[PDB]
Amino acid sequence: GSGDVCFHCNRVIEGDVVSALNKAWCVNCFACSTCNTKLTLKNKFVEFDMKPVCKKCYEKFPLELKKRLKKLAETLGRK
Numbered sequence: 001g002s003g004d005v006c007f008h009c010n011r012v013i014e015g016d017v018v019s020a021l022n023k024a025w026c027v028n029c030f031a032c033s034t035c036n037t038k039l040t041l042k043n044k045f046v047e048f049d050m051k052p053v054c055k056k057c058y059e060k061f062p063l064e065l066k067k068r069l070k071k072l073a074e075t076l077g078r079k
């Protein structure tokens with residue numbers, strides 16, 4: 001309930017602002033782009049290719065690749 005505009009839909013956050021890619025994302029719009037699983041600050045997820053990825057998908061990548069994809073969310077994720 002901060003009041004940011006979920007860059008995912010460009011509309012005022014209707015729930016919690018999921019800071020992704022340093023932008024504000026709706027918990028309703030932000031969803032594992034690899035599973036369509038609704039993303040929530042309580043659920044486990046990561047940023048990949050500028051898209052959300054559930055921890056299960058982040059695990060579907062080779063151990064040496066996930067550490068590289070996680071490198072994205074580290075700077076292109078929560079701020």
Ligand SMILES: [Zn+2]
Pocket residue numbers: 006007008009010011013025026027028029030
């Ligand atoms: Zn939204």
Ligand SMILES: [Zn+2]
Pocket residue numbers: 032033034035036037053054055056057058
């Ligand atoms: Zn997934």
